[PDB]
Amino acid sequence: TPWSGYLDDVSAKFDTGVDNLQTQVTEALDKLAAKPSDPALLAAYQSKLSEYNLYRNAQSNTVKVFKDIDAAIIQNFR
Amino acid sequence: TPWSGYLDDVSAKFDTGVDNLQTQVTEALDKLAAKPSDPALLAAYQSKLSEYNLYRNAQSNTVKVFKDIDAAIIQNFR
Amino acid sequence: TPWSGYLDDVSAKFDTGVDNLQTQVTEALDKLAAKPSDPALLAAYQSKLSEYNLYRNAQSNTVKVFKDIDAAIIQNFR
Amino acid sequence: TPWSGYLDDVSAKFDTGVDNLQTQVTEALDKLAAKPSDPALLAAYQSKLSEYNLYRNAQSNTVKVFKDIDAAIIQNFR
Amino acid sequence: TPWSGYLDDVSAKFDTGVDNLQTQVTEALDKLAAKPSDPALLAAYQSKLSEYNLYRNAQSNTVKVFKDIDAAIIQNFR
Amino acid sequence: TPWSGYLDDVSAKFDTGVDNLQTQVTEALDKLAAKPSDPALLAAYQSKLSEYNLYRNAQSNTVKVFKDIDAAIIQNFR
Amino acid sequence: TPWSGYLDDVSAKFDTGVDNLQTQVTEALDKLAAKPSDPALLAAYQSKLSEYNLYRNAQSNTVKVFKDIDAAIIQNFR
Amino acid sequence: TPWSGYLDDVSAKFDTGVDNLQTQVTEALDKLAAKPSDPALLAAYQSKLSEYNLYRNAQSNTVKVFKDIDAAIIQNFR
Amino acid sequence: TPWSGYLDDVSAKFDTGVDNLQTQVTEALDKLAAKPSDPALLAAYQSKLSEYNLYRNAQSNTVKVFKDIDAAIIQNFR
Amino acid sequence: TPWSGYLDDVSAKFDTGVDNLQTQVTEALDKLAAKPSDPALLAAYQSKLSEYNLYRNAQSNTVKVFKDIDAAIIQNFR
Amino acid sequence: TPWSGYLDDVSAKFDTGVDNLQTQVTEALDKLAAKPSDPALLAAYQSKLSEYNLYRNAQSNTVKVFKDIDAAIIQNFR
Amino acid sequence: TPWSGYLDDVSAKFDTGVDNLQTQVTEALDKLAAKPSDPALLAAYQSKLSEYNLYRNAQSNTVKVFKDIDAAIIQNFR
Amino acid sequence: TPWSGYLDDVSAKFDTGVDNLQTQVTEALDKLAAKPSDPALLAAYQSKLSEYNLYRNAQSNTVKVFKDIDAAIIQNFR
Amino acid sequence: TPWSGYLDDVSAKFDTGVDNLQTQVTEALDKLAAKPSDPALLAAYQSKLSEYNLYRNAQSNTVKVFKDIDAAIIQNFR
Amino acid sequence: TPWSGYLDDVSAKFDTGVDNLQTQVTEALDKLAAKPSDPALLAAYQSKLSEYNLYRNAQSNTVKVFKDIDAAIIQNFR
Amino acid sequence: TPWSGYLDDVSAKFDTGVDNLQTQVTEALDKLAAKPSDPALLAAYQSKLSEYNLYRNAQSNTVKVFKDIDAAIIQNFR
Amino acid sequence: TPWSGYLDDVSAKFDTGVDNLQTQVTEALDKLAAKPSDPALLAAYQSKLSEYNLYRNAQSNTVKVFKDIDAAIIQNFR
Amino acid sequence: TPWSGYLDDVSAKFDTGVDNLQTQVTEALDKLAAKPSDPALLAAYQSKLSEYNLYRNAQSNTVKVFKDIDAAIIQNFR
Amino acid sequence: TPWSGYLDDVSAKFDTGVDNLQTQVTEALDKLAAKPSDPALLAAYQSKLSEYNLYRNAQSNTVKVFKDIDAAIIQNFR
């Protein structure tokens, strides 16, 4: 069994929270690349790419906060 | 079930708000191409194409604003 | 229900404002073609064709103005 | 009571400043559509439509300026 | 009873301070989507969306300041 | 397979929409050049050349509009 | 009966003082993960996460102070 | 009579030194929340919130210094 | 007597330095709203609104600098 | 004394630089309206109206340049 | 084997997505240069050059977004 | 070796694409000037001068497009 | 049999408590090094590296506490 | 005679080293407030305010260093 | 003697480097205001105003760089 | 044999992980410098330079984290 | 010595490049005004006035380009 | 020997990469100034000036990127 | 003989390592000040000023590291 700590659980709440956003960004970019001027494909790709920016920022900043929570508790052992 | 975030909902309010504007632009251009000098078809195509310009601009600028709302909230986690 | 935006309403105020000017130009040209030297038919066709020129110009320039009103509002979202 | 912020007040100074310019543009276009070649109706509609262009541009650019005033004050909290 | 701390009170002063700004942005966007070229609906949506940007920025930066007030007091226990 | 994007499809809707207008302009000019004073050939060439002017203008202005739709979406990625 | 000393009482005054802050941080993160761009969920999660930082720091620094009170009394037995 | 030591006097010199800064921050935030885009209210709230940051930091660091003065005198009893 | 600290004095040097710029922006916008196409009123409103932008930016950035002066002195107490 | 900043001085150098150009445009238009076919009045009104166009453009673009000079200095305080 | 990272893969999805758009722009410009007034060659070159503009902009802005995704994750290592 | 960049290559594709159009315009104008009423020389000079207009416009607008392609890539380095 | 004392048992509770965290940090860094811009690999490496920081700090501070427990018991033999 | 220790001498070397920098910052801010858009006054105020930031930081960090020199000598009396 | 630090010297290298550019902008604007349509005065004023923009930007950005050089040296005293 | 510690191994996992990214940045810049307007060379250089930024940041921040892991273990020897 | 920068040199290359074009336009207009129907004076004045239009446009657009070259270099100091 | 660092080498790769582009812009402007209406000299000057814009932008943005690479490495010494 | 310790040697390795970088920054700024719009002087000054930033940061951070090496050795005498 692969081990997963508490920060691995917080980082995987976002991974299991979105269903296939890592796939839909890949699929919308592959549909965009075949024809990069259809406004039905650009506006669909903007809304996924702007979503994927806020996905990776809110994931990475939450893990940073719970790091500095624990690093100020663990410093208080001594 | 295909996942759709909040920016996917704002981009799909415009898609469900207009009924078949993506179709009517395609249908009016197909009626125009068969006879590109009828003023009943040019003036009908102008009013749909000028509409479709304001549709894709107001969609794409609204998603840009809600991006910079969230990117100034998520930066305040740390 | 076929969708009609605001520019579709301004372009259709001229269409519903005149009753059958798109028909009377077609009917006067069909009466002219059968006998293209009657001054009762030429002077009746001049007054409809000069009317139909000012109809399509005042329609098409009004839609152009309300386009550049909105394209200078929508540019001010960002 | 419907809430109205400061930018809602600046956008409503222009709305209450003009009396019925949103109505007069609608009324002059309805008088124009019934007879789109009267120069008494075209020149009256030009002066209202050119007014309504400068109304919506000076409204929308003023709200844009007071946005970038506040977004450079609120960025200075942190 | 759901618990609400001091930062929950500062974040809810803005929520109770505006009456229904979270609703009016949703209602004005729903009125905009049905007809995205009416200047009466675009200029009304600009003034609410520019308001909603300054609402979420002044909320999120105030909570950030009171965080760094407390994190420099609580660090002075030891 | 030769690639054709979305603007290539809009420019080829006009090409496939007219059947042989690029040929009929060439054929009517070749019939005109052999005898450039027959009114049956001048009036047939006027109606094709005035058609071919409105064909290339409505093609080239439609591609220009869909360019400025996409260049205002793609600018909103960043 | 599980034993709880004096430092266990000081650490459990904060646990019983907040009602369900350990739950509300978990519940707000679970509501955030399903849709990580709603500003109603980000600003609600910021105010709980900034609260939970000051909860664990003021708990852990208070226990550190009462440790160094007692370790300077108990050193004075000999 | 509620007892107040020497560090209670140093912490209350700042409390009695400012008159109602704990009130003016609360009053300016309540005036800000009703209309969070007035630059007369944002710039008035910035100058009080930046003041209240330097108030709580200079209070909390002064009490920390007089603690480490006394903890290096009291350690010299033995 | 309402208390005013040092940052309150720097923010009020700009308030007392300009005489009635908060009034003249309000008065010029009220004169503009009654007739938003007079170039004598637009060019007078541009010069006040561009002034009021540089007023609130130079006020808010000066208070930010004197904050980070003091927050690097007060951090050096301990 | 009504206050006038630096941009108010640059906008009033053009106002005091021309003597009565705001009056001469008004006076020449009033002489034109009484008899709008005299070439001595049309050619005199063309030279004032073409002057008044270059007056308001060179005024409004100069104030725009000195705005973006100052907004790139004031941004360099922080 | 020449190495290609993740941004090299996103930049090469557009390169492999279009088949020979870098060639067709070169070939249509070479056909245009031999005879720069054929409307069959100008309208074919407009649709490729307007396509090639949207190709290089959507490529270069996508790589910019995935840069600022990663530069806000990698900054959160420390 | 005189250096020639990419825009120098696009501007020289038109120069090498036409053989001696810069010479034929000069030669036809020199034949026209000796006898400026021969219809064999006027109609030959019209077809070269109308060609030379479309040569310098399609050259100068192509270089402008490839400039704004690169200035939107190079802006994305930072 | 290799000997392991009590502090060796406390340091090996963390080693046996995590399964292969010393391996997963090594494996995620080896997957990162082959392509250091994939956000699926950066965000997976952040959550393991922030975990591995809290692993080695909570291990090393626990062994330090049980050292100073024993060094204040063993000093009380004499 | 008012007493001044060694740290009072180091803090007063900077005070006597600059002549009237505490006055010139006050005088340049008073000249700025009367007209906050003159670039001759903004660029003169930037160079004094950026100087006054480096004055108070280099003063306050030097006194901090000579404190931690002495607090590691005085701790070595016992 | 009025004191001038190092940033005062860098800001005064630009002041003494140009001879009377602060005067020539004032003199060319005074010559422009008396006659704002002479192309000999507009093109002379463009070249001075575009120069004065690059003067105040290169002055203000150089002082900003030498500030952040020193603020990263002075932070390394402690 | 040149010695290489553990941080030398982590810094050389990135060096051996990419194959010749230090060479490809040098080679793409040398191809760019010979012709700095080819979009095939700019877009190829953007994707390598944006890659090389994320290479040196993820290398340098990983070495910083493993430094502060070890400096909090080695401090616990005493 | 009157100072002349680089843009003053580019604007004076056109002034010294033409010999007396500012004089010949003045002299040909003075010869035209005495007898404004001589075709030897009209055709001589057309060729100078059409020259003087291209002189002031190519001067004023070149200075605009070298402005936006420098304003994108000077912005890169910070 | 005049010293040249690494950024001096990157800025001189563009200088040695182009052969005499700093000379050809100067030579083409000197040929243009003697006769500023020859289309053989305008179109040759456009292609060099549009080249020289992309030369100085790609030089200045590359040096900016390698600055922010190094300023994020050198910040990680401490 | 003026004394120079070990940190004086590390700070003077950078001083003797660069030849005349303290002079070339002074010389390039003096060449810039005489003509602050030449792109040959701005791009030469950018590459020296960006170099001089990395010179003083890598000098000042190296001396800070060797300070905290020695202050953790010298603390271990007692």
Author numbering:
A (entry chain N), B (entry chain H), C (entry chain D), D (entry chain G), E (entry chain M), F (entry chain U), ...: 3 to 80
Anything the authors wrote about it?
The entire structure is traversed by an approximately 2-nm channel that serves as a conduit for the T3SS protein substrates as they pass through the bacterial envelope.
As it is possible that constrains imposed on the filaments by their tight association to the base could result in structural differences, we sought to obtain structural information for needle filaments attached to the base substructure. PrgI needles were boxed out from fully assembled, intact needle complexes and segmented into square particles for 2D classification. The α-helices in each PrgI subunit and their N-terminal loops pointing to the solvent were clearly resolved in 2D class averages of the helical filaments. By applying helical symmetry in the EM reconstruction, we obtained a 3D map of the needle filament at 3.7 Å resolution as determined by the Fourier shell correlation (FSC) at 0.143 cutoff. The resulting atomic model is in good agreement with the cryo-EM structure of isolated needle filaments, except for a slightly smaller rise (4.24 Å versus 4.33 Å in isolated needle filaments) in the helical parameters. The structure of the PrgI monomer extracted from the cryo-EM structure of filaments attached to the base is also entirely consistent with the structure of the monomer extracted from the cryo-EM structure of isolated needle filaments (the Cα root mean square deviation [RMSD] is 0.509 Å over 78 residues).
